[PDB]
């Protein structure tokens, strides 16, 4: 029984390393639409799931109370925070204001 013919993936792996470093993905290399390459629904789902997970962790850890949690939950559903860092900054600002008032 002769062996199967070779179908090598070395070229593809070198190209994959290059594309990991950021090569070969520019304006002239894109054939599909932006939403085809990276749907906005997928990005929104990821961002909102991150925000809700962070809010649940903060509520369970008692860094925020249930009222601040509800306000931030509705604001996160309302596209107020661009990423996790923006939400964390808002939380810290609210906590500082509460500390001053208290």
């Amino acid at each position: 029984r002769k062996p199967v013919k070779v179908h090598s993936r070395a070229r593809w792996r070198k190209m994959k390393e290059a594309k990991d470093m950021g090569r070969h993905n520019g304006v002239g290399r894109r054939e599909g639409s932006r939403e085809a390459r990276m749907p906005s629904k997928e990005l929104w789902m990821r961002r909102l799931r991150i925000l809700r997970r962070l809010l649940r962790k903060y509520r369970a850890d008692k860094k925020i109370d249930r009222h601040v949690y509800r306000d931030l939950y509705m604001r996160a559903k309302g596209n107020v925070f661009r990423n996790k860092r923006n939400l964390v900054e808002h939380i810290h600002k609210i906590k500082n204001e509460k500390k001053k008032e208290r």
Binding site: E17, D20, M21, G22
Partner: peptide, 12 residues
């Protein structure tokens, strides 16, 4: 993955 690879670091 966690850190983006550098061409220069391939030396070592």
């Amino acid at each position: 993955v966690a850190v983006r690879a550098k061409v220069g670091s391939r030396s070592y």
